[model samples]
Target: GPASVPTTCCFNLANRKIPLQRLESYRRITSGKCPQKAVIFKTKLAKDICADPKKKWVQDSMKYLDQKSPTPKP
Candidate 1:
């Protein structure tokens, strides 16, 4: 079996926001390898949702998740 690599880019942005409670984490995708910049939200159900980085809801969700479980600074 071949080693797997997780998706690193978003082809499209979701038009609506997923419930904040359902989202567990998020990662920002840049525009280098991808066609556009996006934020990828991971839901508790193990689902990935692509959202526009400039969307208010996406920013709010990212802030919420960050406050919920912030990454430790090195």
Candidate 2:
């Protein structure tokens, strides 16, 4: 097949870290089409999304796979 048109990126629970990697234990990152980049986002997703090149949705779709959850309820 040929190229579609453009590209995209994101930052879900994966790109979206639970805490500092250098200092953490038993952590779980997300999966999927994430914006492969480390960040220091803690209490401001909106701010992080705005500052980050890839938006939250992109990160979510990239890193956090829906399959991880039984349904979208969680």
Candidate 3:
């Protein structure tokens, strides 16, 4: 059961990058009520880490994850 709106908001950004292999999934958090725009990376341990959206490595990781687990077409 997915919520109609985003519940997780990033108040802080990660100072370091997590290894690509360590990440399980990711979701973009837009700045509406949130203080800043961020990318939330979910690790294998089910930890959610916030990352800056503008970073080169962050964008690259998002792309990598997209290819790693693409959504199935109906």
Candidate 4:
């Protein structure tokens, strides 16, 4: 009985925006996994993640990466 409540995260995908969240519920769309219609999450964890970390926007977005999320989900 140690399940953490799921939440959504903000992610920018090549100018496109999406609610970055893990969807493993098969009860929903195709095995519950999110679809990659146009873009994906901009995080380094993304399979095909993209972005210039040095860029102002990139740096601005992930400025509080490691610090903000002191802890990560499993």
Candidate 5:
């Protein structure tokens, strides 16, 4: 079952301090929103995300989120 509140956040190696509002165990979000019209995943703290090419979390999340997003074309 889903908790009533978020209990954790992604601690990245980039030294960012963005507090993510978790939608699920791996799904998360911040208060920021992209200005573009398209359903793009843009963020100011994006550098902390894919900072490591060898890391699989970001790439894995991309595939997972794309599948779950309600966009007509993802």
Candidate 6:
């Protein structure tokens, strides 16, 4: 059976401060809009998620994106 979900939040890593941006993004992505955006919005405090060939999470995420994104016609 379907269920209703109230507002929700999760604890921050290490410290008590919460990454509000990440949580908001979580809600947005979960609602299903991965067509033209990263699963998690880019944030440094959340973690340095940018161009880096050696980082697995970053590299993998981008590869996943490349596959879904459209290529050039010419």
Best by TM-score: 1
Q: Model 1, poorest ten-residue lDDT window?
A: 1-10
Across 1-74, the per-residue lDDT of candidate 1 in tens digits comes to 53487666777788888788788888887757876788889899988888887888888987787778747862
Task: Report how far residue 1 has shifted in candidate 4, in Å.
Answer: 41
Candidate 5 clashes between residue pairs 3 or more apart in a chain or in different chains: none
**2 versus 3: better TM-score goes to:** 3
Q: Give the TM-score of candidate 1.
A: 0.73
* Candidate 2 Cα lDDT to native: 0.36
lDDT of 1 at 26: 89
**lDDT tens digits, residue span 1-74, model 4:** 53474422223435532222421111111223443222213333434443333445444444434334546682
Q: What is the TM-score of each candidate against the true structure?
A: 0.73, 0.18, 0.70, 0.28, 0.26, 0.28
Error of 1 at 61 (Å): 0.8
lDDT by residue (tens digit), candidate 2, 20-62: 2222222233446543633323332333321232546334433
- Using lDDT, give the best candidate's number: 1
Off by over 4 Å in 2: 1-53, 66-74
Q: What are the RMSDs of all candidates, in order? A: 3.3, 12.1, 5.2, 13.3, 11.9, 12.4
For all candidates in order, the CA lDDT equals 0.81, 0.36, 0.79, 0.34, 0.36, 0.34
| Residue 50 Cα positional deviation in candidate 5, in Å, after optimal superposition | 6.3
Question: Tens-digit lDDT track for model 5 on 1-74?
Answer: 76875433333323322222332323334424422111122344442331222335444444555566676854
Backbone clashes in model 2, listed as residue pairs = 10-58, 10-59, 11-59, 12-59, 14-30, 31-63, 31-64, 32-62, 33-62, 34-62
Which regions in candidate 4 have their CA more than 4 angstroms from the true location?
1-48, 71-74
TM-score of 4: 0.28
Where in model 1 is the C-alpha error above 4 Å? 1-8, 69-74
lDDT at 48 for candidate 4? 42
